[PDB]
Ligand binder design. Structure first.
Ligand SMILES: C[n+]1cn([C@@H]2O[C@H](COP(=O)(O)OP(=O)(O)OP(=O)(O)O)[C@@H](O)[C@H]2O)c2nc(N)[nH]c(=O)c21
Length: 186
């Protein structure tokens, strides 16, 4: 007879995820300022990471945190992002204190907990931008043309964050990045 796995195995996550950190430095290419922190694929390992790193609200302006499925780099150029887009959450200066941190954690939980159910395969990850003019959080998806998946993900995400329902958020395609209107709204 063998031991009861319930008493000792870590609680597995559907996907293995990777957390990245971005430190702004004008003298270097965007990609050069983007570096991996570490990866994890269990509930225990997620908290071990989250608990020892600074809350988004404490980072220096210009820095980002990005949680993307293992194998998908948090950039437009990636095979899994080039044809996709993002649901953007735009926060005001007051929300840095009131909602940024709780919104980001809920975002992390939505990702690792596969809260988008049937459309989990369309989800790539999420990014939080700490900025002086106003912080930003966003869920990135793989194909801007998958209306069904994209709209359902947006609705679910918006409901999970729990902000006033009357507030509309938009979805923008990465390819449409101005050298930017929304494709969908919920
Ligand atoms: C997500 N992303 C951001 N950048 C670079 O980062 C710059 C800033 O893009 P940003 O997404 O970090 O928002 P920010 O608020 O800092 O600035 P703004 O929206 O223009 O006011 C871009 O114009 C790019 O030069 C990126 N550059 C490359 N090559 N690939 C990416 O995926 C990528």
């Amino acid at each position: 007879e063998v031991a009861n796995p319930e008493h000792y195995i870590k609680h597995p996550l559907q996907n293995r995820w990777a957390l990245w950190f971005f430190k702004n430095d004008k003298s270097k290419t965007w990609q050069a300022n983007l570096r991996l922190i570490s990866k994890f694929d269990t509930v225990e390992d997620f908290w071990a990471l989250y608990n020892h790193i600074q809350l988004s609200s404490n980072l220096m302006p210009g820095c980002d945190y990005s949680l993307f499925k293992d194998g998908i780099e948090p950039m437009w150029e990636d095979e899994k992002n080039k044809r996709g887009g993002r649901w953007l959450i735009t926060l005001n200066k007051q929300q840095r204190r009131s909602d940024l941190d709780r919104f980001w954690l809920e975002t992390l939980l939505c990702l690792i907990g596969e809260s988008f159910d049937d459309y989990s395969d369309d989800v790539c990850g999420a990014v939080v931008n700490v900025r002086a003019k106003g912080d930003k959080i966003a869920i990135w998806t793989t194909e801007c043309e998958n209306r069904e998946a994209v709209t359902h993900i947006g609705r679910v995400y918006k409901e999970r964050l729990g902000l006033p329902p009357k507030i509309v958020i938009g979805y923008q395609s990465h390819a449409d990045t101005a050298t930017t209107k929304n494709r969908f709204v919920v």
